[PDB]
Each structure stands twice: as C-alpha cells, then as structure tokens.
Design a protein around this ligand. Structure first.
Ligand SMILES: CC(=O)[C@H]1CC[C@H]2[C@@H]3CCC4=CC(=O)CC[C@]4(C)[C@H]3CC[C@]12C
Lengths: 188, 196
C-alpha cells in the first residue's frame, strides 16, 4: 500500500523537483484521492522521509573491508537500480535550498547525520584492527570521505552522466582508501 | 553604471528564491530600475546569470597574475585562493551557493543550466591545459591520464564545495581546503591509478 504512494512521489519528485510538486499531483500519479494519501503520509516531507528511509534500508540490508565493498556496490546501484538512481538525482539536482523546501532539507540533514555517525563508527572500529593508524584525524577523515563521495555523485549527475561511473567510481574509491590508510594530511 | 546594480539585484534574488522562482520583473524592482532599462542591459534572465558567471570568472582570472614560481605552483595558489575567496567574498559565496544549491535541474531552468554547462567546459579546458603544461614542465608524469585527472580534479573540488554548503558551513573551510587540495595534488603527482 504505502509503497505505491512512495514510488509515485519519487516519480513526481524526479520530473518536477520537490519544490514544484504538490500532494495533489502525487495522489493523482498513484491514482488515489487526496484523502487516501493523507492517511499514510501527512505531507511531502513525510514521503521524502520514507523514501530516504528505503534507500538507507536498501544499503543496510545488503551486508573495513566491508566498507570498501559497500562503497563499490553503492555506485553500481546508482546505475542498475532505478529507485537509487532517481532518489539521488532528486537529492543532488532537484532539491533547491529555498525557504519553501526548508522542511525537506531538514529531513535530508537528519539522514545525512546518521550517515556521518555510521562512517565515524566504521573508522573508529578500523583504527583498532590496525587497518588505520592510531593518529588518524577522524574528524577530518569523515569530511574527507563524504566530500569525496559527494563530489563523484554531483559530478556524475550534473554532467548528465557524461562519463562511465562503473569505471570511474572504483578508481576514486581505491585512491580515497589509499589516502585514508597512508596520507599524512589525514593524521593529527 | 546601473548594470552592476541589476547584477547585484539578480544575485540577491537568486540567493533568496532560487533561479527558477525568480522573475525578470522582480530583479528590476529590487534594482530600482525600470523594466525597459533592464531589457536595455539584459535580454532575459539567463543573460543576467551568464553575466554573473562571467564576473566570477573574471575575478578569478584577474588574480592569476598576482598568484604568480612555475605554473603548477600557480594552479595550487589559485585553488587555495578560490576557497579563501569563497569564505571572504560575499559575491563568490552567494554565487556558488546559488550554483550548487539553488539551481534545480528542471525544464523550467533549462536555459540557465545550458549557460552553466558552457562556463564549465571552459573550466574543463583550462584544467586540461594546466595539466598539459605540467607534463611538459615535468611536474606531472608523461603517462598521466589527462582525461581521468580532469574528472578527478573536478570531482574533488565539487565535493568540497557541495559538502561545505550542504553542511551549513559547519566545518572550517580555511583548515579543510588546504588538506583536501594537498591530498588531491599529491595524488595527481604520485598515485599510480591516475596513470595510463
Ligand atoms: C582558475 C582555474 O584554474 C579554474 C580551472 C578549474 C576551476 C575549478 C574546477 C572545479 C570547480 C567547479 C565549480 O563548480 C566552480 C569552482 C571550481 C572549483 C573551479 C574554480 C576555478 C578553477 C580552479
């Protein structure tokens, strides 16, 4: 039930962006009344919330060496999975930071916060297995990892997928992994 | 004269409501200028935006003689100066904020996006030339893969900008940019996976 309402929201978000999308438009695309949507999702914010939730759940249910493979499969998924493609397209390209979109942005910052605590934890555990050095600057390292991954995603979507993500993502990730283990700039 | 006032007005409004929701008429209302005076400087909205991108680019290019021994060194200085300016120059902050966060890739914005893609292909070519000079100068290896390195540089830099704006400027760009740039330059110089 609720899953049908989410995908229409995702599809509408993908064509018009979040700002210029209305509940009315979503309920029509799913072919239900404005009243029927409201029972499950009280506003656009909540649909966006559930959609981000399915993305994070997808990534969770597919599981330091695991970290690498999790990064690799995230970028494959962007190409082969239609929902992950559209959601991150929407997040990066169709989600203006205007005052109208303020509740959405707050929702997205909530999920981004979880993603950060989770990276912080993986690094915390990796330092103990002697995978990473004990004087690793973890605060810098987490800005580094997210900035690396954000940059590839933004560069891929904003260039209109003008390069081969399947060939580029592994090289970017491997280099990132190398810098985390070895580069002195990432040490305290 | 008052073409600057129209430009600052367009910048402030784009920053307020994003590009798509902003109108030609409300820019001129914020600039204290008649509609016909606006069409006297600016045929439409994407020309205002193109003139904003041009000003950002002029500002950056104009510093390069002052950023300059050797050009691979100049590149490093231009990158560092860019993020410095992002922090200290309101026009450059607002413009890149608009570019990354207030310019939806919808059909309503198609003309503006085409303009943005034009200034980026120029930036692409400028990188490709910087790299090319650095191979001949022996600052980079003869078997560097220029096509990969360009995507690498743009990816790295886009990520830092996107991260900083998205996070609400929640980390110190003045401390992070040199580290990010340091690592990127090191990789271009040394990392095997950027060679062919
Ligand atoms: C002046 C200069 O060398 C140009 C060539 C490459 C350009 C950068 C390439 C990546 C980039 C993407 C943007 O969205 C604007 C800022 C930046 C960070 C550009 C700033 C100006 C640079 C550094």
């Amino acid at each position: 039930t609720k899953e049908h309402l989410m995908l229409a929201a995702l599809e509408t978000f993908y064509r018009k962006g979040i700002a210029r999308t209305s509940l009315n438009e979503i309920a029509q695309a799913a072919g239900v009344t404005r009243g029927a949507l409201y029972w499950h999702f009280k506003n656009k914010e909540d649909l966006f919330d559930a959609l981000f939730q399915r993305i994070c759940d997808d990534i969770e249910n597919c599981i330091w060496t695991v970290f690498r493979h999790t990064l690799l499969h995230f970028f494959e998924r962007l190409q082969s999975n239609d929902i992950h493609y559209k959601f991150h397209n929407i997040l990066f390209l169709k989600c203006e930071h205007t005052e109208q979109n303020a509740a959405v942005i707050a929702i997205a910052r909530k999920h981004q916060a979880i993603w950060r605590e989770k990276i912080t934890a993986v690094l915390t555990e990796a330092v103990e297995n002697q995978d990473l050095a004990d004087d690793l600057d973890k605060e810098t390292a987490v800005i580094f990892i997210k900035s690396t991954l954000d940059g590839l995603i933004w560069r891929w979507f904003s260039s209109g997928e003008s390069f081969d993500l399947g060939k580029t993502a592994p090289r970017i990730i491997g280099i990132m992994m190398d810098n985390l283990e070895n580069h002195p700039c990432l040490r305290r």
